[PDB]
Amino acid sequence: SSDEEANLFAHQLARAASLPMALKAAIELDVLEIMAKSVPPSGYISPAEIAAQLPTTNPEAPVMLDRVLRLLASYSVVTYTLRELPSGKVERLYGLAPVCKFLTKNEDGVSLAPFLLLATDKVLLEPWFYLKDAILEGGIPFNKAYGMNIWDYFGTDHRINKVFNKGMSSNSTITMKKILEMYNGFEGLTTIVDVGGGTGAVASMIVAKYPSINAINFDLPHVIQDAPAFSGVEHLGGDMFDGVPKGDAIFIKWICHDWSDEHCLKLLKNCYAALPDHGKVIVAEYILPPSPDPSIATKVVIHMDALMLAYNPGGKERTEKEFQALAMASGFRGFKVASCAFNTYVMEFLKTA
């Protein structure tokens, strides 16, 4: 019965995708939001009460919903309680687990739900069918699937460009709120460039905290076209590999992990050129731990490394030494790990140390 446990595990592995796809459906139905707003003083609500708030009105909706919520409950995505009905049978009622705090809109209208919709999108699951091909043939699984780099594909496909940019905006909003409570390194700058800033969430947050700072959000044209106006942020489109806007500091969050070491050095030399004599690059990334331990924090970084292998041209997760090596090879003389929040480190690459 080491056998029994191993056979079970193999089954669990085989079906693991069903959990995020069940969660995706629950998000796309607005179930977790319906729960947050309807739950009584107990904490729990029935699938029938949930389903009366959905636009259906499929008589099989309440049972289908219960079956989905039961899977989420088994993994503690939602909580549950049992209630015995006269009509003997016991039903499940569902409540919010702590993770739902990040899967439903906070006080400012933000959650990780759009990030989950990106992670579970048909476009991001397709490259995984070409992992074996890329290993044997060379190249990038995404490019085998779509015939071009991820960014170029986003420039062709308006729906996924929007899902991607919204997903990064949401995740970054949540993490940068915490980084900004811990990290002081934006204090005193007069101008900050967010290179690869997406739709400008991070730039906007920096301006909100430091009203005197002028921020530049720089990304590809096809991203910058959808960036909402925010007073104190200028959205500039271009290509970071040709050059970046000038500023007192440059912020790059989740950019280096997208790119090979050679591409990173190219970018970082462009950042060095764009900065004044004593300026800096602020790098926000995961940092690879020494081993594939089974901690969730490590598992999450290793999962990202594998995503970078599926998606990106040479992208990968890096150790602190590897980052320090990049800084050095692009001309910076100092390196600091400055801060950490929600598993994301903030590094500074200083032109003078």
- Binding residue for ligand N7I, selected from 36, 119, 302, 325, defined by CB under 6 A: 119
Q: Binding mask 306-325 vs a copy of itself (x if CB under 8 A, - otherwise)?
A: xx-xx-----x---------
Concatenating the DSSP letter of every residue in 285-327 gives: E-B--SS--S-HHHHHHHHHHHHHHHHSSB---B-HHHHHHHH
Binding residue per annotation — 172? yes
Through-space distance between the first and last CA atoms of the chain, rounded to whole angstroms? 60
In terms of CB distance, is 72 or 255 closer to ligand SAH? 255
In terms of CB distance, is 47 or 196 closer to ligand SAH? 196
* Residues contacting ligand SAH: total by CB under 6 A: 16
Distance CA 172, CA 205 (A): 10
Range 75-81 contact pairs with CB under 8 angstroms and sequence separation of 24 or more: 75/19, 77/19, 77/23, 78/32, 78/35, 79/43, 79/44, 80/44, 81/42, 81/43, 81/44
In the complex, what is the shortest distance from the CB of residue 301 to ligand N7I, in angstroms, rounded to a whole number? 12
Q: Is 323 in the site for ligand SAH (CB under 6 A)?
A: no
Q: Binding mask 254-273 vs ligand SAH (x if CB under 6 A, - otherwise)?
A: xx--x---------------
Q: In the chain, where does DSSP find H-type helix?
A: 2-14, 18-28, 31-38, 47-51, 61-74, 100-103, 113-119, 122-125, 131-137, 141-146, 150-154, 158-182, 201-209, 221-224, 261-274, 296-311, 320-329
Q: Is 315 in the site for ligand SAH (CB under 6 A)?
A: no
Residue 311 interacts with, from a copy of itself, ligand SAH, ligand N7I, none (CB under 5-8 Å by kind): ligand N7I
Amino acid in position 201: A
In the complex, what is the shortest distance from the CB of residue 309 to ligand N7I, in angstroms, rounded to a whole number? 11
Binding residue per annotation — 219? yes
The residue among 193, 197, 353, 348 whose CA lies nearest residue 280 is: 348
Helix (H/G/I), strand (E/B), else coil: 351: coil
Q: Is 10 in the site for a copy of itself (CB under 8 A)?
A: yes
Binding residue per annotation — 253? yes
Distance CA 297, CA 99 (A): 15
In the complex, what is the shortest distance from the CB of residue 253 to ligand SAH, in angstroms, rounded to a whole number? 4
Distance CA 140, CA 341 (A): 31
From 64-72, 90-98, 113-121, 201-209, give the range in contact with ligand N7I by CB under 6 A. 113-121
The residue among 113, 282, 277 whose CA lies nearest residue 196 is: 282
Q: How many CA atoms, within 13 angstroms, populate the side-chain half-sphere of residue 164? A: 21
Q: Is 159 in the site for a copy of itself (CB under 8 A)?
A: no
What residues numbered 225-254 form the site for ligand N7I, per CB under 6 A?
254
- Binding residue for ligand N7I, selected from 172, 173, 217, 312, defined by CB under 6 A: 312
Helix (H/G/I), strand (E/B), else coil: 241: coil
Bridge partners of 283, per DSSP, are 252, 347
In terms of CB distance, is 54 or 119 closer to ligand N7I? 119
Place of tokens 């925010």: 230
In the complex, what is the shortest distance from the CB of residue 274 to ligand SAH, in angstroms, rounded to a whole number? 13
Residue 103 interacts with, from ligand SAH, a copy of itself, ligand N7I, none (CB under 5-8 Å by kind): a copy of itself
Q: Is 12 in the site for a copy of itself (CB under 8 A)?
A: yes
Q: What is the CA radius of gyration of the chain?
A: 23
Q: Would you call 257 a catalytic residue per the annotation? A: yes
Q: Is 220 in the site for ligand SAH (CB under 6 A)?
A: yes
Catalytic pick among 11, 158, 222, 257? 257
Q: Which tokens go with 345?
A: 């480190």
Instruction: Give binding residues for S-adenosyl-L-methionine as ranges.
Output: 172, 196-197, 219, 239-240, 253
Catalytically active residues, by annotation: 257
Residue ranges that bind ligand SAH, judged by CB under 6 A: 151, 168, 172, 196-198, 219-220, 223, 239-241, 253-255, 258
Which residue ranges make up the annotated binding site? Answer: 172, 196-197, 219, 239-240, 253
